[PDB]
Design a protein around this ligand. Structure first.
Ligand code: LPP
Ligand code: LPP
Ligand code: LPP
Lengths: 258, 149, 148, 257, 148, 148, 150, 148
């Protein structure tokens, strides 16, 4: 029914904001509720291994590939102008203030934005997440709080590693594959980036996603209906919403500081 | 009634998200601890070819403010530029002449204000009476450099 | 009031259809650009760099956008059709047009120059006199190779 | 134990080079095996609705956002070069030559590279596929062949729509808030875009990691084990497809700058 | 059902529209706003920066697109083959086809004059006279060395 | 287990080292490139293209950067505050700083031409003699309308 | 034995990826028929400031070929440039001079070729003996600014 | 099945170590003894567009590189050092070394005119007579501001 079709559309629209409110309530209860008996730093270490260290190969190979792509592309574009000796400035500018954090968002929200959701989802749907409440250990401060704290402090480091490897792998193609002066590359690079305006800007732009990607990647896993299909649908809702959030919040955070 | 609280918090946070409009949201464009308010001023020119809004109005080179309006008067067909000047500088005499200079050789054309000399400073919300136009390439070339040869 | 909350579906559609209209609102006009623009025509001898939608200017400030360019098959001259803002309507007929250059490299934009006479315009009329656009050939071919 | 770890690493190295073989044989059996009794075009339409039309609301908004980002950024890096008019010849180059086609891969392989493998793995887990061979219908050419054909002909259209919306967003933000002359903007853009080396280049660049994203999104779901198996296979395909988007991006742009 | 087919058809049409838009409204090709066009040959003693896909023009309005350049293996001249929109064919044969640098540092395009009122054209014929391509050398190799 | 704890530690330290490498080997940050040196003031008539962090120089080789631009409201002139390399402490007071464009169209920097005097520098004193920056308008506006 | 076939076709696919498609190496462009067969030409100049490699060599503006390399003739202490010409255009006489020209006003310096006047055409592997050097903003302004103005 | 399991494992490890060794070899690829490039000094009165690692050349072709620039504390003038490929070792001392501008706007480089004929060089010596780089101001400041 068309009127019931609009009813269902409005229902989904209100469900979205209801879920957003439930999600921020869940994040509040997770980050600063109380110190549960089972809580410890070993949790954070295990998750930092499950979220960051496992996501190192993907992000490093991505950095190398996207870096040599950025270089081999700009060198063509700069060849017509003649300032190819400034290619090093280009990759260190785009892959460090815009394409660095954005791609490492689209990618950290792909591996650890889906692995996290599927993991704690399969937790919820095998009662492993409920059986923690019977033992008394609040699941938030034990199952998700280390996920949140291992996403907050592992996506910025991933973005830094990604930008470093991308810059280096852009040099490795501009220099030893397309032949520009390596010294010129590095020199013209470190004269036009203005750390306090581009490097720290990219780091803040990456932190804001790190907060908004590991929050909608662990909520969407703590909220999926407990079945084998609700989980396979949540590990797609989280990738969609996290790529969308990376893009949108990067648009905001670059309009906030050009 | 948990949906009530969830929707309440969801709206209270979607507001804080749309509290990031970020489209001329901070009408002051420097920081949260700089000078702040600004004075208004107008000038009537014969040609304002390159005075695109949000440019720079300066004195002796140091930026003083930005152009806000580029209006045109219907009666005299002269462009009326409405700019603002930072609060720190408020001591420019009325006889000061505004002239449009070209930054470098091709850079954005800015409006400088060469100080004349008088005691009465300004109303800072009033207009300028004198000026010097913006030398456009075509009219200049055709008139003078063509006239020599 | 949940059956009443079908109205939020309309709150979203009217908020999305408004976004759609804003997507087609790309004209740069609220009260400033044109409001309700009006036609005028001009005949130049050379319009080298006045590709369509370029800003027209009186005393520098923009007035409208050149709506189209035309090669009048009769005399092979450039008849440009340009739109003018509503509020600006005191432009006399003897106000002649000329092709200035954006800065020193930017693409050419046309401007008008008030000459001053009683009969203002007709907004569908045309401009008779004008000064053509310069060209780095005639300038050195007819004025550098000519006397030097 | 070192020696057992080296044995396991060699085993994984033989597996990944054998999986590519099994995946290639699966693709072969899927695309040109025979004509199964239950196939048709209705399947292609249905899976084109699940792969493409459901993945419109993500990549269109992504195109808008990355377009205004590309413009609002280049203009800032060009405000100091004096050529703030070349923005048109940028948001129609970066968002066309490399970033626009690539991000559509990094994103299509997140919405329809993961939902595809979940929908085609949970099928294997709920016995759907195994219950299709008993009806006589070849599962490959009924369940996975329409996925492949809905990924081949819906990622390039996604990339084209993404690039169009990105160009228009870069325009809207380059003219409204940045004040760049719309005329010179569209002029420089239309002039320096060189169709045969940028538009068709982006399109073939998109077809490559369409064929390669829908291939490893469908296979990774036709070869997964249980809910824990699929919940891992979807992560595996998201990772492998982002990797094969970026790697194929490098390899392709090296063959045509 | 049918909503499925309508949705997928709309999506396919949107994809094809996006492809055609990226082609035409961004680059432009044989397909596009322009219809049929006729070729014309011309002989320049030099075509310094003239590349394909220039803007052959008259009085500023675009007349078409240049198609091919060649060094005539007999006279060592620049044979330029260009396209002219059929919207304008009234141009005379006995005109001058000059090259002009756009603005100050724009693309070196081709302009043509009006050749009186003689036999109009064959649209596939050649041109008689043309002003060669100016460069920095033919100027600053005579008027800065062998002059004041 | 400590079997993986080093892995987390190793790659966290790797991330932090990468942050430091981005902040140091790409930006020349406060690790030490030029020491803690003292400022010097200069009074000009026009500082148009004198942005912050310009390249204050002598004989072409870099000396340091300008820290601040100011409009001293008393005489309405340009107060530029620039840092001088501390080891370079032989710049006499009679030396004059002039605003020069870098080469032909580079950013407007200031360069200090040595005058030569016994007393050298307070490193915090002001300069007196200078040649203010040129401006196209005043330049072509006073040497084209009168001379030729 | 099926795993053997799987790993075999896997190696085959990896070979199809690496050998045929990757390695970004030697050009087979028209290596069978309809080729260009670029041929070398030497030219001695006095200043080749903006004639870096991969530039353009042209006659009357239409590109004739590209510049292969540049070097310093140790004995002459002058610039030597080696550039290629397509075998289709083999009608350029010997006394045809080369000249460094600037594209537009700022476009990179290419090598134009002014035709000669002898009947001996070329060898396409020979040299060019007479030419005109390039300009340089400093020596140029250094000549006619303080000698014919003051 | 196991005699070749760890065999292919070690084959892959060898391939990976070869790849890592290929990656590491960028920084200091094969510089060794700087090939056959040896230092030589130069003095100038003003070197504006001469930054580190600039270009040096003779007759246009690159001769080597521009090593470093500095300010001598005594004469308050600019010293610069450059590395010269030994393939050219016939550059006499009376050879001049001026500053030129790449094309017309490209970054300033150092060109060397071979000069006369005398004792050649020790590649570690110091060139003596030369001409500085033009600065825009003084030109228009003494040829326009004074003569025309
Ligand atoms: C020109 C105008 C156009 C510009 C539009 C602006 C868009 C702004 C960007 C949109 C955000 C995308 C998020 C998508 C997620 C979603 O839809 O949300 C969808 C889900 C609910 O969906 P379900 O139906 O599946 O439950 O909600 C959530 O997951 C809740 C978490 C969302 C978090 C939102 C972002 C918070 C911002 C925090 C910033 C402050 C950080 C600073 C800390 C240091
Ligand atoms: C993956 C990402 C790929 C992006 C790389 C694509 C390069 C295309 C360059 C577009 C602009 C070309 C142009 O006109 O560039 C020309 C300009 C200036 O020339 P003009 O002044 O003559 O217009 O050259 C420059 O100095 C800047 C070049 C473009 C800068 C864009 C850098 C990449 C954008 C990434 C966002 C951060
Ligand atoms: C114009 C040319 C036309 C282009 C032709 C397209 C080529 C297609 C090749 C795609 C290969 C993927 C096959 C399917 C994979 C699969 O399903 O197989 C999936 C299996 C998974 O096995 P597991 O079960 O063990 O996880 O293996 C993979 O995950 C493969 C990872 C995909 C990575 C592809 C990247 C290729 C490019 C690499 C860059 C090279 C580095 C060099 C840089 C210096």
């Amino acid at each position: 029914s068309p009127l019931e079709r609009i009813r269902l559309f409005g229902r989904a629209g209100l469900d979205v904001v209801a879920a957003l409110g439930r999600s921020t309530l869940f994040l509040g209860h997770a980050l600063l509720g109380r110190r549960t008996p089972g809580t410890g730093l070993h949790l954070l270490v295990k998750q930092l291994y499950s979220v960051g260290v496992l996501s190192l190969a993907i992000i490093v190979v991505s950095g190398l590939f996207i870096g040599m792509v950025l270089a081999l592309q700009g060198y063509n574009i700069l060849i017509s102008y003649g300032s190819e000796q400034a290619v090093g400035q280009m990759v260190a500018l785009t892959l460090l203030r815009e394409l660095g954090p954005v791609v490492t968002g689209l990618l950290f929200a792909g591996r650890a934005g889906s692995a996290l959701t599927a993991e704690i989802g399969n937790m919820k749907a095998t009662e492993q997440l409920s059986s923690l409440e019977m033992i008394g250990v609040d699941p938030l401060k034990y199952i998700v709080a280390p996920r949140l704290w291992a996403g907050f402090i592992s996506m910025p480091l991933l973005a830094a590693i990604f930008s470093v490897v991308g810059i280096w792998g852009g040099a490795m193609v501009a220099v030893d594959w397309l032949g520009v002066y390596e010294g010129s590359f590095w020199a013209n690079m470190q004269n036009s980036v203005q750390f306090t305006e581009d490097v720290l800007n990219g780091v803040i732009k990456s932190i804001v996603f790190a907060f908004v990607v590991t929050w909608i990647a662990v909520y969407q896993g703590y909220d999926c209906e407990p079945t084998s299909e609700g989980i396979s649908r949540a590990t797609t809702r989280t990738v969609v919403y996290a790529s969308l959030a990376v893009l949108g919040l990067d648009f905001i955070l670059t309009a906030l500081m050009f | 009634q948990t949906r009530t609280l969830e929707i309440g918090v969801g709206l209270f946070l979607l507001a804080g998200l749309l509290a990031l409009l970020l489209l001329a949201l901070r009408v002051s464009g420097l920081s949260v601890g700089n000078a702040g308010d600004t004075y208004k001023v107008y000038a009537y020119f014969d040609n304002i070819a390159g005075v695109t809004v949000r440019g720079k109005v300066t004195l002796a080179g140091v930026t003083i403010g930005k152009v806000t309006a580029v209006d045109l008067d219907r009666d005299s067909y002269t462009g009326r530029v409405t700019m603002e000047i930072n609060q720190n500088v408020n001591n420019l005499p009325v006889d000061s002449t505004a002239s449009i200079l070209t930054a470098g050789l091709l850079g954005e054309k800015y409006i400088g204000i060469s100080v004349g000399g008088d005691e009465d400073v300004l109303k800072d919300g009033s207009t300028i009476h004198d000026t010097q136009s913006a030398l456009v390439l075509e009219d200049l070339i055709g008139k003078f450099l063509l006239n020599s040869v």
